Structure 1
Amino acid sequence: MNYGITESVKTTRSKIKIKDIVSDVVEKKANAIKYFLEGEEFKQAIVFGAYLSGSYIAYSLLKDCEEVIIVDIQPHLKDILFNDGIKFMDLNKLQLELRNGTSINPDLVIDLTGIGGVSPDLISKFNPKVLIVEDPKGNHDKGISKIDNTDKRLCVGAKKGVLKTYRSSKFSKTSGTMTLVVDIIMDSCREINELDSVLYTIPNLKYFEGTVFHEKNVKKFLTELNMSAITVSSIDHVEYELEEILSKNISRVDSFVKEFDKLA
């Protein structure tokens, strides 16, 4: 900790970093999938969508899956991959290998693309034992519900599930990792600002999605996540309360896979 303009004001940066919030949310999504799979083993798993939770989710499936393949429409996202054991395939390469080849016949398909993502037509080409589709919808919004087609994507699999992620007692427009991280920080700032002696509270946010998809720079994106989530200007010490508010907001994240019953 340091001082601000003069020694009468303190500047406190949270120990909790943006990457720590991202890690907690992705781990909750990976654990939801793990719980839903009930320790079942698979020959080949295909995970659509590398950013932002896909990387850690694919890595978490290596223990029970002989082969894990991440599929992404953006080839540069091979850089966001967690481990060498995860195979990366461009959408162009997958489509080609499906038409002319027998190497692709997964028993576990996980769709994490969400809004404007994979089409139900591509999903229908598979015949897995388990199909998991991530529902990008958070709390109610007409515009988001209209563009969402999660139900149409659950067209294959003996066992089907929908990965849902919300914040308990708080409003979020989507279940997206980025949306949730931003909402956790924003909600923490509003409460932090009400602590006695606080002058102002800064959420250290920027359009991180732009660094990944517009600048096509995964390395820079990961560096940007290394910043303290919040910076506070105050007369008195707030370091304790600052981590407790952030932690409380991170703990509200609840992720689970809802099983979709289809008897045939």
Structure 2
Amino acid sequence: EMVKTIDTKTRVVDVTNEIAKKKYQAIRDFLEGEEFKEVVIFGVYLWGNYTAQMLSKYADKVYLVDIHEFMKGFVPNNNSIKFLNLNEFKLKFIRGEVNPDLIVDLTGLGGIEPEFLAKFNPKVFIVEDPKGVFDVDIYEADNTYKRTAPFIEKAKVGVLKTYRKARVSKTSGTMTLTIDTIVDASREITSLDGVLYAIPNLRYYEGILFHENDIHKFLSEISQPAITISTLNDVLDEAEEILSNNINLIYSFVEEL
């Protein structure tokens, strides 16, 4: 028949990976190759392990810390990185067994407490700003600049921001940006000659993690093609180009305080 079905080659996980790569490039540009004795990163989901893997070439030791123990599943059996849950990390800290010179806080809304951060004395502190477009309630829920306050006087402080150029996203969260990229791409693909419709293939992946604690299933579901297209014409290349253009709109940078 005249109507074809086309899945994009780009998967949801390819979009999340491209966004993590951009976020890390912003941190890399900020750090300019500074070397560290001990790095602590708070927050595994969704790009903390990628960050840890990348920073480990610049650090003697890297700790990746999460309040949820099941997040251990995202951290490879390698030893250039140590996963700790938050309670294990607190215990190490009370014992004087950790003393990081770089801290990266990726925990975002409702995340790690300023008061706890204030107990540390790093050379460099980077916090990810979870905010996106102006929103009274998300702004009120955010306390990013309270997390930076204990460090301004003595450390190099950076605030990591990620936005979509001339497009609306409500947060800088890797998943939020992924959803908005793929939904927007589906609308632009719809407009292409001969296309009847284009489905963004998205699921509530966060529930598989935070409710079901099932990393294998999370990974299986995010490997799905990003978009499925019903069309009279072969538009795969155009659709890939559209997804690429929407990814290239995402802009990540570190604000130095």
TM-score of the aligned structures, taking structure 2 as reference length? 0.96
Describe how 1:73-152 pairs up with structure 2 within 5 A: 73-82=67-76, 84=78, 85-99=80-94, 101-152=95-146
Moved over 2 A (4+): none
Partner of 1:189 in structure 2?
186
**Unaligned segments of structure 1, at least 5 residues:** 1-6
Maintained 8 Å contact 1:59/1:83: no
For the residue of structure 2 that corresponds to 1:131, the secondary structure is strand
Q: CA RMSD in A?
A: 1.0
For the residue of structure 1 that corresponds to 2:255, the secondary structure is strand
Partner of 2:233 in structure 1?
236
Determine whether 1:42 maps to 2:42: no
**Partner Cα separation in structure 2 for residue 240 and residue 51 of structure 1:** 31
Maintained 8 Å contact 1:172/1:180: yes
For the residue of structure 2 that corresponds to 1:102, the secondary structure is coil
**Partner Cα separation in structure 1 for residue 145 and residue 87 of structure 2:** 25
**Unaligned segments of structure 2, at least 5 residues:** none
Partner of 1:68 in structure 2?
62
**Partner Cα separation in structure 2 for residue 62 and residue 83 of structure 1:** 14
Q: After superposition, give the CA deviation of every residue in 1:172-202 in whole Å (9 maximum; x if it has no partner).
A: 0000000000000011011111112211111
The offset of 1:220, in angstroms, is 1.1
For the residue of structure 2 that corresponds to 1:68, the secondary structure is strand
The offset of 1:72, in angstroms, is 0.1
**Partner Cα separation in structure 2 for residue 254 and residue 86 of structure 1:** 28
TM-score of the aligned structures, taking structure 1 as reference length? 0.94
The offset of 1:83, in angstroms, is 5.5
Equivalent residue letter for 1:145: Y
Describe how 1:137-216 pairs up with structure 2 within 5 A: 137-154=131-148, 155-156=150-151, 157-216=154-213
The offset of 1:233, in angstroms, is 0.3
- Percentage identity across paired residues of the two chains: 51
**Partner Cα separation in structure 1 for residue 125 and residue 98 of structure 2:** 15
**Partner Cα separation in structure 1 for residue 113 and residue 17 of structure 2:** 28
For the residue of structure 2 that corresponds to 1:62, the secondary structure is helix
The offset of 1:82, in angstroms, is 4.4
**Partner Cα separation in structure 2 for residue 257 and residue 14 of structure 1:** 32
For the residue of structure 2 that corresponds to 1:70, the secondary structure is strand
**Partner Cα separation in structure 2 for residue 127 and residue 83 of structure 1:** 29
Equivalent residue letter for 1:234: T
Choose the corresponding residue for 2:49, options 35, 51, 55. 55
Choose the corresponding residue for 1:219, options 216, 220, 230. 216
